[PDB]
Amino acid sequence: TLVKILHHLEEPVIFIGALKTEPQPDEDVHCDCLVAFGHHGRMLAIKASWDESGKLVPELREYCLPGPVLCAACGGGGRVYHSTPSDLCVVDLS
Amino acid sequence: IDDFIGSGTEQVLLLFKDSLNSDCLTSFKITDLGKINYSSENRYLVVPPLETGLKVCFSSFRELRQHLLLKEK
Amino acid sequence: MAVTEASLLRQCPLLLPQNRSKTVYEGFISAQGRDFHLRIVLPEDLQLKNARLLCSWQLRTILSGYHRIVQQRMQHSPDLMSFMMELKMLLEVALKNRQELYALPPPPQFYSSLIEEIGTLGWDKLVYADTCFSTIKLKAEDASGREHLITLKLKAKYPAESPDYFVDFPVPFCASWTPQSSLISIYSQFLAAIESLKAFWDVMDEIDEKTWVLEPEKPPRSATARRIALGNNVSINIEVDPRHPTMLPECFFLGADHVVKPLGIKLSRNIHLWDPENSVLQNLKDVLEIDFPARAILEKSDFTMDCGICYAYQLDGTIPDQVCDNSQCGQPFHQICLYEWLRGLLTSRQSFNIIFGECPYCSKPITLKM
Ligand SMILES: [Zn+2]
Ligand SMILES: [Zn+2]
C-alpha cells in the first residue's frame, strides 16, 4: 500500500505449524498438512483430498485432546509433541 | 526428592541409619511408588487403557458442560 | 403435518422464530443425537432463491465439501420445510462418511462391566488390549497345549451388539450372540470349536514337525493346504478337510514326468489301504510306501533347484515346480518363465492349455500345461 478468516477455534490459539503426513537431512521438507492448537485442547488439522468428485477439497478435522495445553512443537515424520500440566503427550498424524 | 534415574518423573530417596556403616548413602531406598523401586504382568497390563478411559470421559464431560452453557445462552 | 405451521415444529423442534414476522429462525438442528447451532435469516418475503445461512465453525467444518450443494438447494428448493429435511439427511450422510470421528463409550456400563467379565474369565487367557480399549486379543490352550489367539473389536455398546470376532483357524466360527451372552460365552464357543478341530490341528502340527513344509513358511492357522517336499525337485501338495482331517485330502504331485508316474500308479492301487483311524502321515507312509526327508538343507545350499531362467528361488509366491523329462538336465523352471520363453520360439505349438517346446538348457521336448 485483504485479511482472511479460516476457522475460529473457540479458545485461544497457542501453536501453529505444519507436518509431513504419509512420509513415503534436508531442512526444507514439502509440508503436506497444517496444524493449529487451542489452550483448552482443541486440535485442528487440514489436508488435500482430491477424491470422490474429481476436485481438490479441503479435509478438516477437529480433535479435542485432553487437558489445558500449555505448549507444543512438531518433530520428524508427522509427530507433534505437546504438554498438559499432568504429562508430556504426543500425537502421530502419519 | 528428585529424578536420580533420568526418566523425567521425580522419585523419593530414603537413607537408613549410620548404625549399618560409618558411611554416607549405604542402605538406600529409591522409589517412584509405581514401577521403579531399587534398594540394597496381569497387574502392570490393563492400566493405560483405563487411564485413557478417564481421559476420553473427562473430555466428553467438559465438552457437554460447554454445550450446556451454549443452550442456556 | 401438511401445513408448515406444525410440520416445522415436528421436524425441526428447536427452531425458534425470533422476529414476529417469521424472518429470523434460530437455534439447533438435530443429527445422529447431536444438536448444531444455526441462524437462517430469510428476506422480508418467503424466498430461498435469496436467503442467508450462518453457522458455528463446527457446523462449517462438517459441511466442508458440500458448500455448493447447500447453495444449490437454497436456490432450487421450494419452501423452508423440505430445505431443512434435505439439509438434515445431508448432515446424516456427511457424519456417517466421516464415521471415524465418533465413539465416546458410556463409562458407567463399559469400563467397569468389561473389567468384571475379564475377572470372570481369568488373566491367563488375555494377550492384548488397546489404550482406547477398542481391540482385544485372547489366548486359550488346547489339551495338546497350543496357544490359539482371538481378536475382538468391541463397539461403544459391547453387550448390546455382537463383538466382531477375528480368528486365525480356517473354517468360519459362528457365535450365537445374545445381549445376555458375554466374553465367557464366546470364549466357551471358541473352546468348543477348538476342541472340535483339535484332530485337524494334531494332523497339521505333526506334518510341520516331521516333514519339510515347503510352500507355506511359518504357516498361519487358517492354512489347509501343505506343499510338502519329498525325494528331490519333486513336491506333493495336500489340502485337508478341517471337519474330516484324517479323511482323504485332495492330493497331487509336481515334478518329473518320469518321477511322478510311479507315485500316481502306487496311489491308485493302494488308496483302499487308506484308513481314517490313523494320522495323515502314518497313512501316507503305507499308501505311498516311502519315508520323507526332514529339511535336507545344508548339504545343497546352492544346488539350484531355482528357475534356471531367472536363476532365483521364490518368484512372487511361485516356486520352481516344472522340470525336464531328462536324466541329464533335471533343470527346474517356473511356469511363468517357461511359458514366456516358449511363446517366442518357432518350434513351440500351443494345443488347448499345454505348450510343447525345447528345454532351454538341453533342447529336449518339454511340455507345459497352464
Ligand atoms: Zn523364474
Ligand atoms: Zn532340459
Curated annotation (Swiss-Prot), chain A:
| Record's signal peptide | none
Report disulfide bridges, numbered on this chain.
Answer: none
**Places the protein is found:** Nucleus
Q: What does this protein do?
A: Plays a role in Fanconi anemia-associated DNA damage response network. Regulates FANCD2 monoubiquitination and the stability of the FA core complex. Induces chromosomal instability as well as hypersensitivity to DNA cross-linking agents, when repressed.
The entry describes its oligomerization and partners as: Belongs to the multisubunit FA complex composed of FANCA, FANCB, FANCC, FANCE, FANCF, FANCG, FANCL/PHF9, FANCM, FAAP24 and FAAP100. Forms a subcomplex with FANCB and FANCL.
What's the name of the protein?
A: Fanconi anemia core complex-associated protein 100
Q: What is the source species?
A: Homo sapiens (Human)
From Swiss-Prot, chain B:
The record's subcellular locations are:
Nucleus
- What disease does the record describe for this protein? Fanconi anemia complementation group B: A disorder affecting all bone marrow elements and resulting in anemia, leukopenia and thrombopenia. It is associated with cardiac, renal and limb malformations, dermal pigmentary changes, and a predisposition to the development of malignancies. At the cellular level it is associated with hypersensitivity to DNA-damaging agents, chromosomal instability (increased chromosome breakage) and defective DNA repair. Some severe FANCB cases manifest features of VACTERL syndrome with hydrocephalus.
Its assembly, as annotated, is: Belongs to the multisubunit FA complex composed of FANCA, FANCB, FANCC, FANCE, FANCF, FANCG, FANCL/PHF9 and FANCM. The complex is not found in FA patients.
Q: What does this protein do?
A: DNA repair protein required for FANCD2 ubiquitination.
The protein here is known as Fanconi anemia group B protein
Swiss-Prot record, chain C:
- A Pfam match is FANCL_d1
Q: Can you cite an annotated GO cellular component?
A: Fanconi anaemia nuclear complex
Query: Which residues of the sequence carry a binding annotation for Zn(2+) 2?
Result: 324, 329, 359, 362
The answer to whether keyword Zinc-finger applies is: yes
Q: In which pathway does it act?
A: Protein modification; protein ubiquitination
What does the PTM comment state? The RING-type zinc finger domain is monoubiquitinated in the presence of UBE2T and UBE2W.
Q: What is its EC number?
A: 2.3.2.27
Chain sites annotated for binding Zn(2+) 1: 307, 310, 334, 337
The protein, known as: E3 ubiquitin-protein ligase FANCL
